[PDB]
Ligand binder design. Structure first.
Ligand code: ZQ1
Ligand code: ZN
Length: 113
């Protein structure tokens, strides 16, 4: 069970978001088609970090956090009617976003589908 993010209630999502499709994404910075994270502020789709065991992606999502400070991202492919995998870079943990349905609706994602 994951704790509520300090960012979840007041998260600012940028105007003119993309319509994020239900499948088929790519990292906007490399050819990764798996392990992709949607930043809930700006709708960027970027790959996951390289772990110290050498597993994972090319760090594009975490590099974008370092540049923007936009702290919440959701792992694409984990969204269900029951929730999703949400990471907070600032809190450095998996978190609960009680405003997830609103935050995903901003991108045209209906988690109930
Ligand atoms: O990548 C992004 O840009 C966004 N996400 C993260 O930064 C991130 C960081 C930590 C975590 S974790 O603490 O839940 N946990 C995920 C599984 C991981 C691991 C690797 C490999 C094996 Cl075999 C077992 C276990 C250990 C850590 C989850 N996501
Ligand atoms: Zn990438």
């Amino acid at each position: 069970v994951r704790q509520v993010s300090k960012h979840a209630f007041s998260l600012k999502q940028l105007d003119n978001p993309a319509r994020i499709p239900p499948c088929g994404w790519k990292c906007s910075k490399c050819d990764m088609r798996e392990n992709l994270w949607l930043n809930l502020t700006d709708g960027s789709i970027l790959c996951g970090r390289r772990y110290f065991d050498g597993s994972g992606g090319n760090n594009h999502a975490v590099e974008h956090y370092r540049e923007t400070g936009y702290p919440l991202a959701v792992k694409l492919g984990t969204i269900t009617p029951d929730g999703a995998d949400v990471y907070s870079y600032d809190e450095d943990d998996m978190v609960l976003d009680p405003s997830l349905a609103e935050h995903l609706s901003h991108f045209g994602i209906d988690m109930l589908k």
